[PDB]
Amino acid sequence: DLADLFPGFGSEWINTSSGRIFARVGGDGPPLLLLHGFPQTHVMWHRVAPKLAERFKVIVADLPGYGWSDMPESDEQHTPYTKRAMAKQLIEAMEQLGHVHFALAGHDRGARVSYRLALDSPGRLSKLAVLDILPTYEYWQRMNRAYALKIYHWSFLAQPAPLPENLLGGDPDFYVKAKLASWTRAGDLSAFDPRAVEHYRIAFADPMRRHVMCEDYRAGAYADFEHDKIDVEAGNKIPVPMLALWGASGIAQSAATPLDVWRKWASDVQGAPIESGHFLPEEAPDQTAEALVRFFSA
Amino acid sequence: DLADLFPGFGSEWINTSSGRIFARVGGDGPPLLLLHGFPQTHVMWHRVAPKLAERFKVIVADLPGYGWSDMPESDEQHTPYTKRAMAKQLIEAMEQLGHVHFALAGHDRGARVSYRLALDSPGRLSKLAVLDILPTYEYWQRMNRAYALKIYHWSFLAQPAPLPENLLGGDPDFYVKAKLASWTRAGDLSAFDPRAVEHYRIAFADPMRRHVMCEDYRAGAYADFEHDKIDVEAGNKIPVPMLALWGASGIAQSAATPLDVWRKWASDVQGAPIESGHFLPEEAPDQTAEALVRFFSA
């Protein structure tokens, strides 16, 4: 029913103290962790992971609570879905594989896990790539009318439960397809492999999966913001070499010029626009893959 | 089935070029137009309108597209649900009753119609009361993280059709009750007459009515903002004596001191907080009715 989009990749259930992380694992060479975002799963990497697997051991993980990874129980402060907790859990998952120093590329929510990981435990990362995000602090700080309309879901999904859970349940298939379509350049689903969309749709069909996504956005509005705020105020920069990729019509370039923003957050950051909407690895897999392989090889 | 909450009030279907306005009509004396907002209907005035009917000809109108008023078909610019168009339609409606000069009190969306009416056609108004709002421009201009979370529905309901409509359609009862409860001081529905809630619920149960509400919010995000922006940047002030009432726990006071804001928009404005959430005429009817009687009688 659900297609295997990573031929030659194994499937691993990585145990952590907070639950299992699901990951497809392929290739050999230095470890490279790939983190998806919302409303996707690891399969969003299916077009770039094979090219990366030529040079790296590629670990394509479902974020905690996403896809087939376990859903740790949340609490009053959405703690397990804060990027800090997710980062700690993925660090632990990587340690189960013996990877204590690895390359990391994240898109959307996974890119927020990624830069928070880079801020909290920089020694874990050889190089970091973030796809089509600015730091969470920067999105909220740039909140204005235009941005509020563009990323309305940042405030919608952060509403107290069960408000977004109830509404998302009103038409989950429409919602996930609408989010996928509206953030591509084309404005429809033609950029996606339909087997990939089926993965995203099935994940989104689970009410517990949707609640987790809301918890993630709740963390995004609260604890994630405060964690970012601490770093901004302390002048903490990401010391890892990092690559910022954004879509020419993605979400990140809607708020500011992404490289200028990331230079305030990272001491060694390169960046390039990709002719694409938000979903760089699916809308522009070749340009995304090439930029990633070049950066992660140096 | 729906209760008559205005014993002794007439019922009128006022024809306008944009469709029929429904209104309850009671009392005698100077004409006083009362405009509800979202997600309510004219019945929200059922506790204060009898007090006002002792001294005024009270016209308790459903907004264009709301309640029992006709729903003009919208367009790509949400024109009929812009506050400018709504104001024009209500001017037409009042003219059908022979009221070319009248007092006006609006709450929520109806308050936005009201101040826009006062800016576009101040000669139509003897006095103006706005209940628990700031100008649409000011909400958007003050859109930061905290406020984007508080009034997320401003950006959510402004999302392109059919996204909000599809989400609202899964369980419309939940949403209307959630919004009613969440903006009251108590955070539940105890402030409302259950017969009134039934009116609100039944109106919200109609997908066309929900569409209109989203159109109203889309206008609120685009053309309404643009019209306000023109006025504020041109320094155009409301010249009609006006009363700004707001709930101490309401929406307007959340991101600004309401009277300071209104003093920028109106040359002759007095204000008073009322111990209440957003729904002043139902949460604090006596206090609201007294403030309005005192103001419109002076």
Domains defined for chain B, CATH in brackets: 1-298 (3.40.50.1820)
Contact call for B168 and A170, based on CB within 8 A? yes
Instruction: Look at chain A and count its residues.
Output: 298
How far apart are alpha carbons A275 and A287 in whole angstroms?
Answer: 8
The two three-digit tokens of residue A134, written as one number: 């600015």
The two three-digit tokens of residue A245, written as one number: 């990729």
Give the one of B155, B166, B167 whose C-beta lies nearest to A148's C-beta.
B155
Instruction: Choose the catalytic residue: B108, B132, B228, B231.
Output: B108
Structural determination approach? X-ray
Query: Which residue out of A78, A155, A228, A232 would a mutagenesis test of the B interface target, given it has the greatest number of B Cβ atoms within 10 Å?
Result: A155
Cβ-based contacts of A140 with chain B (< 8 Å) = 144-145
Q: Which long-range contacts (CB under 8 A, 24 or more apart) does A15-19 make?
A: A15/A96, A16/A89, A16/A92, A16/A93, A16/A96, A17/A89, A17/A92, A18/A64, A18/A70, A18/A72, A18/A80, A18/A85, A18/A89, A18/A92, A19/A64, A19/A69, A19/A70, A19/A71, A19/A72, A19/A89
Give the one of A140, A144, A170 whose C-beta lies nearest to B166's C-beta.
A170
CA atoms within 13 A on the CB side of B291: 24
Q: Are strands B21-27 and B10-14 parallel, antiparallel or unpaired?
A: antiparallel
Cβ-based contacts of A141 with chain B (< 8 Å) = 145
B144, closest residue in chain A (CA to CA):
A143
Q: Is B278 a catalytic residue?
A: yes
How far apart are alpha carbons A253 and A244 in whole angstroms?
Answer: 11
How far apart are alpha carbons A149 and B37 in whole angstroms?
Answer: 21
Contact call for A148 and B145, based on CB within 8 A? no
Residue in A42, A169, A164 with CA at minimum distance from that of residue A108: A42
Q: How far is B160 from chain A (nearest CA, A)?
A: 10
Cβ-based contacts of A180 with chain B (< 8 Å) = none
3-class state of residue A208 by DSSP? helix
In terms of Cβ atoms closer than 10 Å to its own Cβ (0-12, 13-18, 19+), residue A141 is: buried
How far apart are alpha carbons B33 and B30 in whole angstroms?
Answer: 10
Contact call for B143 and A148, based on CB within 8 A? yes
Contact call for B167 and A163, based on CB within 8 A? no
Q: How many CB pairs under 8 A join A and B?
A: 75
Give the one of A141, A156, A166 whose C-beta lies nearest to B152's C-beta.
A156
The two three-digit tokens of residue A138, written as one number: 């920067």
Helices and strands counted in chain A (H then E): 15, 8
Cβ-based contacts of B140 with chain A (< 8 Å) = 144-145, 148
Per residue, the 3-state secondary structure of chain B, as one string, reads: CCCCCCCCCEEEEECCCCCCEEEEEEECCCEEEEECCCCCCHHHHCCCHHHHHCCCEEEEECCCCCCCCCCCCCCCCCHHHCHHHHHHHHHHHHHHCCCCCEEEEEECHHHHHHHHHHHHCHHHEEEEEEECCCCHHHHHHCCCHHHHHHCHHHHHCCCCCCHHHHHHCCCHHHHHHHHHHHCCCCCCCCCCCHHHHHHHHHHHCCHHHHHHHHHHHHHHHCHHHHHHHHHHHCCCCECCCEEEEEECCCCHHHCCCHHHHHHHHECCEEEEEECCCCCHHHHCHHHHHHHHHHHHHC
How distant is the alpha carbon of residue B101 from its chain centre?
Answer: 19
Q: Is A286 a catalytic residue?
A: no
Reported resolution in A?
Answer: 1.8
Residue in A52, A43, A31, A224 with CA at minimum distance from that of residue A133: A224
Q: Name the one residue in this structure whose structure tokens are 């087997």.
A: A195
Contact call for B144 and A145, based on CB within 8 A? no
Contact call for A152 and B155, based on CB within 8 A? yes
The 10 Å Cβ neighbour count of residue B226 is 15
How far apart are alpha carbons B150 and A165 in whole angstroms?
Answer: 17
Amino acid symbol at A146: A
Task: Tell me phi and psi for residue B269, to 5 degrees.
Answer: -130, 130
How far apart are alpha carbons A143 and A146 in whole angstroms?
Answer: 8
The two three-digit tokens of residue A265, written as one number: 């957050």
Q: Which residues of A belong to the annotated binding site for fluoroacetate?
A: 109, 112, 153-154, 217
Cβ-based contacts of B156 with chain A (< 8 Å) = 152, 155-156
Cβ-based contacts of B221 with chain A (< 8 Å) = 145, 149
How far apart are alpha carbons B222 and B225 in whole angstroms?
Answer: 5
The two three-digit tokens of residue B74, written as one number: 């919208």
Instruction: Choose the catalytic residue: A108, A216, A228, A231.
Output: A108
